[PDB]
Design a binder for this molecule. Structure first.
Ligand SMILES: [Mg+2]
Lengths: 135, 56, 64, 189
RNA sequence: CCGAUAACGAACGAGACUCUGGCAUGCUAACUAGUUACGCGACCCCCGAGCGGUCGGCGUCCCCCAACUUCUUAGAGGGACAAGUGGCGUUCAGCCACCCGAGAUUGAGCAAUAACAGGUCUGUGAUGCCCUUAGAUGUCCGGGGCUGCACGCGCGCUACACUGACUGGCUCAGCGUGUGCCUACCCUACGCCGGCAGGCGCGGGUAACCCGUUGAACCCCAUUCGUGAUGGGGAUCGGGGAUUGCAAUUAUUCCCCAUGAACGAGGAAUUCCCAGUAAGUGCGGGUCAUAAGCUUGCGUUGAUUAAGUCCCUGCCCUUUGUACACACCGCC
């Protein structure tokens, strides 16, 4: 127990992972060596605590989007978001479910009686609203 | 720490000055703060071009 | 007539008790019947998977 | 092949009750030539159960300040007491010690400080580890009290304490104390 | 610390840091450290070994006349990160267990804002005020006192015994000190005398060079004692002998022979303590002309119990109530 890492190591690990994600890897004994030259760390204990947290954070990064930024994950996001645009829209459906109450609204706006509109049967019962209070 | 003798008694003066860090070691100390981590800034070094080979 | 001394094996530890931490409550199942199991407070260092003897069948059952 | 104190093979000893088999350490890897193998047995919980029981007896037998570090003397005392118990019984001293521990370890006790209800307060069961610890403590206390102000040697008093506890004759201090504890636990049920 | 977020960005403290301990047959080195090997020896075996066994005996930096750094010393470095595996966890921060490993919580030092009518004017040529300043409260000298005892309390030492005491044999340390500005007073080997404390000559050491390979105690192995206030305990007290000092009476200390008192494990209460720890057990340093029952350190032997709780004693955070704010030892 008592193995909590403080701001001094966590912020440094996040910064060096952001700057040198490509060079860094899954090996603790190699991350401790790259930490020799990517930053000036006054103490060996501080440097290997930082290296251990770096390896832990890289294990987290290889699976998920940790708050520490990464250019590969950033460009993958910037791809997914602007892409997977479907070849056919979800808004060009041939038939559209239209309530008769909603149907009269289009009549005033004189855009009703379209082919894609299908006048359904409105629900009967008015059974909405949850039972009040407990039970 | 310095004592000052006034007609009412003695005034004690304590002055602490945190020296600035400097590699020259003249205006202050040379070692950095133990918890201060300075990360050097790399260059771009992207190199997205096709694989070529310089001949020299 | 009197109930004989029997054995019960600890399956789970339910935390300390006794107003001083001096007892720990453990769920124990009788070696005679695996299904039949109760909870008893015992003293001394206890870990799951050990057998302790019982001089009586029922003494106590409560949840803290 | 080990022969604790040069004799009395350990493999011939069988543990009586299932409850204390995992906590009495006499056989297989718990087979040492001497009961002095200081090996950091207090560094973690449930590690003294891996300490051989003769070493536990030796550690518990040096008490009351006048002899606290004198473990070589206690090893010698245990060796002699084993010689006497083998001489009296004809059976294995390790078996006698095991049976004495089984019969001396109390099975129930009392606890809680709720205004001291009847004797202590509320009855409680005891763990196997505490059974072993209290058995060894009771045996050592009985031997010490028996041999304090008289001509009988520590080895002889330890021998007769262990013999009486193994045979359950109720002539032993450990057995009498165990019976008293069980009685007050019954009253505090 | 992760996260939620009218907060964001910071600063101190904690941590980080320094010293110490544990591992490096890896590097650097060693006549003020050694180890091996070899040559001279000395003793035993000699049937017959003989590259036999022992030597803290002498040599091979007495410079051409051996190597090496494992042991010792001490520097540079390395090494441990919750790093690897399994499980728990929002799968976050982390937690538990296990493997490999010397090491998976080694001990210390330092240590915030604010404060106390806490202690020191008897540490200071630190100091305000006041007092005294020649029949002195200055300073010096002589003597006495600080020790004085119907009694109460605190820190300790020795014990109450056979898990012991006495007698003998054997056997193992680590800290660290050691010849003086003034200032006079060091640690001591070896030989002789004495029963002892000691005394008398000769050295060595300003020191990994000499004490010193610190032949420590406990422990270990043999002897006597035999459950008794006994060979337990050594208080009290008589006589004698030395040492320090200018001086030993109100015994400075040490030695010898006599006396062997309470004390047979201690009420109510109450202290300290989690691993090389408690405790047993000695040895250094400080004080020291003479000196430790004190203290500060060091080694040696070396455990029982526990890996929890808020019950007592308190502490921290939140909510809450308050007529308190000299803050519940309050107020009324
Ligand atoms: Mg005598």
């Amino acid at each position: 127990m008592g193995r909590v890492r403080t701001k001094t190591v966590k912020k440094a690990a996040r910064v060096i992972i952001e700057k040198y994600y490509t060079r860094l890897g899954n090996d603790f004994h190699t991350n401790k060596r790259v930490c020799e030259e990517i930053a000036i760390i006054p103490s060996k204990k501080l440097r290997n605590k930082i290296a251990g947290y770096v390896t832990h954070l890289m294990k987290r990064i290889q699976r998920g989007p940790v708050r520490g930024i990464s250019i590969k994950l950033q460009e993958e996001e910037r791809e997914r978001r602007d892409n997977y645009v479907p070849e056919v829209s979800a808004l060009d459906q041939e038939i559209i479910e239209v309530d008769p109450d909603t149907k009269e609204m289009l009549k005033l706006l004189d855009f009703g009686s379209l082919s894609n509109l299908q006048v359904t049967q409105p629900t009967v019962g008015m059974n909405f609203k949850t039972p009040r209070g407990p039970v | 720490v310095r004592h000052v003798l006034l007609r009412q008694g003695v005034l004690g003066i304590k002055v602490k000055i945190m020296l600035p860090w400097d590699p020259t070691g003249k205006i202050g100390p040379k070692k950095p703060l133990p918890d201060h981590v300075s990360i050097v800034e790399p260059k771009d070094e992207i190199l997205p071009t096709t694989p070529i080979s310089e001949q020299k | 007539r009197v109930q004989p001394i029997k054995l019960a094996r600890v399956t789970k530890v339910l935390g300390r008790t006794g107003s001083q931490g001096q007892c720990t409550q453990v769920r124990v199942e009788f070696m005679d019947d695996t299904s039949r199991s109760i909870i008893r407070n015992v003293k001394g260092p206890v870990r799951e998977g050990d057998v302790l003897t019982l001089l009586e069948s029922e003494r106590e059952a409560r949840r803290l | 092949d080990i022969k604790l104190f040069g004799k009395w093979s350990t493999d011939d000893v069988q543990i009586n009750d299932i409850s204390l088999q995992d906590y009495i350490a006499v056989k297989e890897k718990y087979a040492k030539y001497l009961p002095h193998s200081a090996g950091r047995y207090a560094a973690k919980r449930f590690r003294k159960a891996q300490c051989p029981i003769v070493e536990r007896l030796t550690n518990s037998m040096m008490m009351h300040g006048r002899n606290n570090g004198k473990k070589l003397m206690t090893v010698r005392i245990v060796k002699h007491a084993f010689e006497i118990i083998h001489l009296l019984t004809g059976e294995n001293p390790l078996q006698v010690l095991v049976n004495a521990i089984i019969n001396s370890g109390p099975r129930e006790d009392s606890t809680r400080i709720g205004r001291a209800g009847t004797v202590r307060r509320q009855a409680v069961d005891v763990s196997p580890l505490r059974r072993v610890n209290q058995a060894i403590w009771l045996l050592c206390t009985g031997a010490r009290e028996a041999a304090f102000r008289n001509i009988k040697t520590i080895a002889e008093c330890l021998a007769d304490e262990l013999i009486n506890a193994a045979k359950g004759s109720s002539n032993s201090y450990a057995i009498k104390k165990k019976d008293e504890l069980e009685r007050v636990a019954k009253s505090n049920r």
